[model samples]
Structure formats: structure tokens, C-alpha cells
Target: GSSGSSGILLKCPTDGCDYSTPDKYKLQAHLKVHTALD
Candidate 1:
């Protein structure tokens, strides 16, 4: 999440991925596959 006062912006992991709001809940829901290889 960003602290920008402009507005909330989000992007899907994949180009064809669902254009839904950042699913923080879902991400946490499936933490088993979550990774931070960056």
C-alpha cells in the first residue's frame, strides 16, 4: 500500500489476472504461497 494522497492504486500479478482491488485479505488467506524473492 502507498501513502500517496493522490489515490489508491493497485496492479495484478499477471497481465490477465483479475483486475480486482488488492486482495490483502486473500493474500494473507493464502500465505502459504506468498513470497518475497525481490
Candidate 2:
């Protein structure tokens, strides 16, 4: 369930890990740290 202007960016691929963001750019920011990009 989500409520706001920005909605549903992504979900972490890992099994035990749960992460989500409404903003696309913000999700990209998370991806940077979540992956090997950084």
C-alpha cells in the first residue's frame, strides 16, 4: 500500500532485504549504493 504523489520506484532484489522509494532519482541514488556502481 502506498499513498502520495510519487509512487513505486523499485524493490530490492535480495530475499531478506526490503527497500523501496517513490522517486525515480532517489531510487537511483539507492541503486548506486545497493550495487557496485559506487
Candidate 3:
């Protein structure tokens, strides 16, 4: 059952994680604070 919210928008496909990487440019944009630079 794919009855999640966000309403018809296809993104954020993760478990124990609330995000999706549809693009890499923007990925590193905010992905930095996620401890990716360490």
C-alpha cells in the first residue's frame, strides 16, 4: 500500500531516511550538513 502523503509527488523513497536523491547537484547542496564532508 503506497498510501503515503506528499500528494502525487514522486520523491523521498527511503526507510529510516526521509529523503530522495533525484539530482546530485542539489544532493551535495544540503547533503553537506548531513555529515557527508566528514
Candidate 4:
């Protein structure tokens, strides 16, 4: 886990979940899933 990535585009809202993304659309979709599960 020493390989650092490039610039970040998004950050997750849920605790203990470090879900990053490169697109806002997909991140929104993932948010729906997280909400449904929550």
C-alpha cells in the first residue's frame, strides 16, 4: 500500500468507508447504494 495515487476527485460520506472516485455520476450511484444499505 505504498503506491500513492494521483489527485482525488471525490470523498465518501460514510465512516469506516474510504470510497474514492474519479466521476461524480458513479459516486452518486454509489451513494444511493450506501443509503439503501444504511
Top lDDT: which candidate number?
Answer: 4
Candidate 4 per-residue lDDT, tens place, 1-38, comes to 46377546788787777888988788888887666953
What's the CA RMSD of model 3 in angstroms? 7.3
The per-model lDDT (C-alpha) reads 0.48, 0.66, 0.50, 0.77
List residue ranges in candidate 3 displaced over 4 A: 1-16, 35-38
Ranking by lDDT: 4, 2, 3, 1
User: How far out, in Å, is residue 38 in model 1?
Assistant: 30
Q: Report the C-alpha lDDT of model 2 over 1-38, residue by residue, as the tens digit.
A: 66675556578565666777666777667666656653
The model with the greatest TM-score is 4
Instruction: Show where candidate 2 strays beyond 4 Å.
Output: 1-6, 14-16, 36-38
Worst 10 residues of 4 by lDDT: 1-10
What's the lDDT of the predicted structure labeled candidate 4? 0.77
Which of the predicted structures, 1 or 3, would earn the higher TM-score when compared with the native?
A: 3
List all candidate RMSDs to the true structure. Answer: 6.7, 5.3, 7.3, 7.2
**Using Cα atoms with residue i matched to residue i, what is each candidate's TM-score against the true structure?**
0.29, 0.45, 0.31, 0.58
Better of 2 and 3 by TM-score: 2
On lDDT, the stronger of 1 and 3 is 3
| Sliding window of 10 residues with minimal summed lDDT for model 3 | 6-15
Question: How high is the lDDT of residue 7 in model 1?
Answer: 39
